[PDB]
């Protein structure tokens, strides 16, 4: 009968330690707050969003303030090809003389980090040149974070609290965001490219002190109204042009060169601007157009579960398109920085997609009404529900037996001294597509390997001018634009498919079995996350919808891991110009053990040793740190509540019976973590361990050999 926790009234009467844990676990779980109403819920969400908004801005301000103060951007802009970007200083009192001596690196005198987020390459392209331009963004974001905070506070006050109808006006939000949020922002970013970014890449300084005076083009805005848009197709930059300075600089602000800049190996600024200007137009027009709509509007989980499903899709795209299409100068050449950005965003994509299906299952338990959803599209998947899972179950089984089978087949015959007996399947359907995209390496000789096809010529309106720049790049093996593939790429791609199929099955089944099955017809009555249904009826562990999300988090990490494992190993050879090592060893699993894990861990594992230490001791310590916390998760997942609760009782007895200690007492009675709690806590250790093992290895292995 204590005041804490406020949001959960029932928890507040629990006299044990469970109260504190669950009071944290049910705090921001607003849908089960005591005495809550729908109108208060929506107004609270809006304000909560501002807090997140402020944090992202502060984070980027923290990404700005520390670089301007302790980084080396001004030093970096001068010759990016050898300077290591500095994240921030190292102020750790436990450091010794020899640890300061090792991390005083990147040409610094005090210890600092070597940054790998790529913000230096991104900010350069955007037009930032000096540390003081950095200092402006952090200060500006500080106000914007406080302005979002004030606004969140503002829209919670009586006179400014919105009504319910405003929050549920779905069509207007899409219209206003593709109008505003998408339309106006993309068009303006083309403007920031042409009014700021492009001049600075051509040696011309444009700042607040002069931006109103210097125009982006010699005689612009007289052709603009008269329809003579073609004047902006004036003289681009020559192949001899040196990025960031005026030796070879042109005057174009809108182009369609295609390919990559020969020096930077990244997109043309003028090319990025036209793309954003064009997409902007598309969203502004579509944003002026406005039974399932009555269902997607009343469930906050359905909207979010699609919003993560949209976020999860485009997060994967960001990883796929940034490694093959580098958009920032020299970002293709900073290989560790190429490695961190791909892995990071791919893991995020896995969480959102898994999360999308997780919140979908919550919708099915608390909001899906069988009688307001009848004879529509939603309830017709529930109709043949047993069919979808059963077929999906088969494909996973099918994929697994054969994909593992081919790898083991190759391994054995290779183990016996006979590599020629391996089963190596050429990715001919894939090799078709690159050849259809213009890659004349595989020689399939149709569709822009065909020099006369109507696609390459485009006899309609003489449009196709991305083609020269593109064809040069697709045949040169100096980038990652449609990388060469062989037997290794075939097997992994089917493994990834196997990973995508097994991960999707559990998440779809979890949502589809959330409301009920034969083993548990009334599952919906117990809510989303509950322990089980006892040892009766054969046993019911891991029967809750939450547990399905929980098991799937193990499968996604494996899937997203295999993708990042594949992407990493392949890139090692290309960056070291010896693609042959990977091509022959990646078709059997011992190669991934000998030439990928063991081989690339040589330096990382020697970050410190009995003879000294180097600048990789953190990564070496973190690697071991990750292994420990990964393994710590196994403890909570294998040993369950009962064992611990009985163990705790002997400690409670011992404390109360020990003089000089008996005198003091706990306020909350000690109890073991809950059944669901342990799964989450175990998985959290496991997953953090999964990443911080991979983060330590990925960064350290590449930073030592380049």
């Amino acid at each position: 009968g204590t005041k804490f926790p406020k949001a959960s009234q029932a928890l507040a009467q629990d006299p044990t330690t469970r109260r504190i844990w669950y009071g944290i676990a049910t705090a921001n779980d607003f849908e089960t707050n005591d005495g809550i109403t729908e109108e208060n819920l929506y107004q609270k969400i809006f304000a909560s969003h501002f807090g997140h908004l402020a944090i992202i801005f502060l984070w980027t301000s923290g990404n700005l303030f520390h670089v301007a103060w302790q980084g080396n951007f001004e030093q970096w802009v001068k010759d990016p090809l050898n300077t290591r970007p500095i994240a921030h200083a190292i102020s750790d009192p436990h450091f010794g003389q020899r640890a300061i001596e090792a991390f005083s690196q990147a040409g610094a005198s005090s210890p600092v980090n070597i940054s790998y987020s790529g913000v230096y390459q991104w900010w350069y392209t955007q037009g930032m040149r000096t540390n003081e331009e950095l200092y402006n963004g952090a200060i500006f974001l500080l106000i914007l974070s406080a302005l979002s905070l004030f606004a969140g506070w503002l829209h919670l006050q009586p006179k400014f609290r919105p009504n319910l109808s405003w929050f549920k006006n779905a069509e207007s939000r899409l219209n206003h965001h593709l109008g505003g949020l998408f339309g106006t922002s993309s068009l303006a970013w083309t403007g920031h490219i042409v009014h700021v970014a492009i001049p600075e890449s051509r040696g011309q300084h444009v700042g607040w002190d002069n931006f109103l005076q210097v125009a982006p083009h010699p005689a612009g805005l007289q052709p603009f109204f008269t329809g003579n848009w073609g004047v902006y197709t004036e003289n681009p930059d020559t192949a001899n042009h040196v990025f960031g300075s005026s030796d070879g600089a042109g005057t174009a602000i809108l182009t369609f060169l295609g390919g990559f800049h020969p020096q930077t190996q990244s997109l043309w600024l003028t090319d990025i601007a036209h793309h954003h200007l064009a997409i902007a137009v598309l969203f502004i027009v579509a944003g002026h157009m406005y039974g399932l709509y009555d269902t997607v509007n009343n469930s906050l989980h359905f909207q979010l579960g699609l919003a993560l499903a949209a976020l999860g899709v485009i997060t994967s795209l960001v990883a796929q398109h940034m490694y093959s299409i580098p958009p920032y100068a020299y970002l293709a050449r900073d290989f560790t920085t190429q490695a961190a950005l791909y892995t990071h965003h791919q893991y995020i994509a896995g969480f959102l997609m898994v999360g999308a299906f997780a919140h979908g299952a919550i919708f099915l338990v608390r909001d899906y009404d069988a009688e307001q959803n009848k004879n529509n599209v939603l309830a017709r998947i529930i109709d043949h529900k047993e069919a979808i899972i059963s077929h999906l179950s088969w494909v996973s089984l099918f994929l697994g037996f054969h994909t593992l089978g081919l790898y083991v087949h190759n391994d054995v015959v290779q183990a016996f001294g006979t590599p020629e007996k391996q089963i190596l399947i050429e990715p001919v359907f894939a090799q078709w597509i690159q050849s259809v995209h213009g890659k004349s390496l595989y020689g399939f000789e149709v569709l822009l390997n065909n020099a006369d096809s109507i696609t390459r010529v485009a006899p309609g309106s003489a449009q196709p001018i991305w083609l020269p720049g593109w064809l040069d790049a697709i045949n040169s093996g100096n980038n990652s634009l449609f990388l060469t593939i062989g037997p290794g790429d075939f097997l992994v791609h089917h493994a990834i498919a196997l990973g995508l199929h097994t991960t999707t099955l559990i998440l779809v089944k979890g949502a589809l079995d959330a409301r009920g099955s034969k083993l548990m017809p009334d599952k919906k009555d117990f809510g989303y996350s509950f322990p089980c249904d006892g040892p009766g009826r054969g046993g019911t562990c891991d029967i809750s919808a939450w547990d399905a999300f929980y098991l799937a988090v193990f499968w996604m990490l494996n899937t997203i891991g295999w993708t990042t494992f594949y992407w990493h190993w392949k890139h090692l050879g290309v960056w070291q110009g010896n693609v042959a090592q990977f091509n022959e060893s990646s078709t059997y699993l011992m190669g991934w053990f000998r030439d990928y894990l063991w081989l690339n861990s040589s330096q990382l594992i020697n970050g410190y040793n009995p003879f000294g230490m180097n600048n990789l001791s953190v990564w070496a310590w973190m690697f071991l740190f990750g292994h420990l916390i990964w393994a710590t998760g196994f403890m909570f997942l294998i040993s369950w509540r009962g064992y611990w609760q009985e163990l705790i009782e002997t400690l409670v007895w011992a404390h109360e019976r020990t003089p000089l200690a008996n005198l003091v007492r706990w306020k909350d009675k000690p109890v073991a973590l809950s059944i669901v709690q342990a799964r989450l806590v175990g998985l959290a250790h496991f997953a953090v361990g999964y990443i911080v093992t991979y983060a330590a290895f990925l960064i350290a292995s590449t930073a030592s050999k380049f």
Binding site: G51, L142, W153
Partner: peptide
Amino acid sequence: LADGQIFTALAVALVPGILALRLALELYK
């Protein structure tokens, strides 16, 4: 950078420093 611009940054950080103290109280309220 300089030494003085660092403290002007730390002086304008109190403007987020009072509202989050108010908004989290307001999100509690």
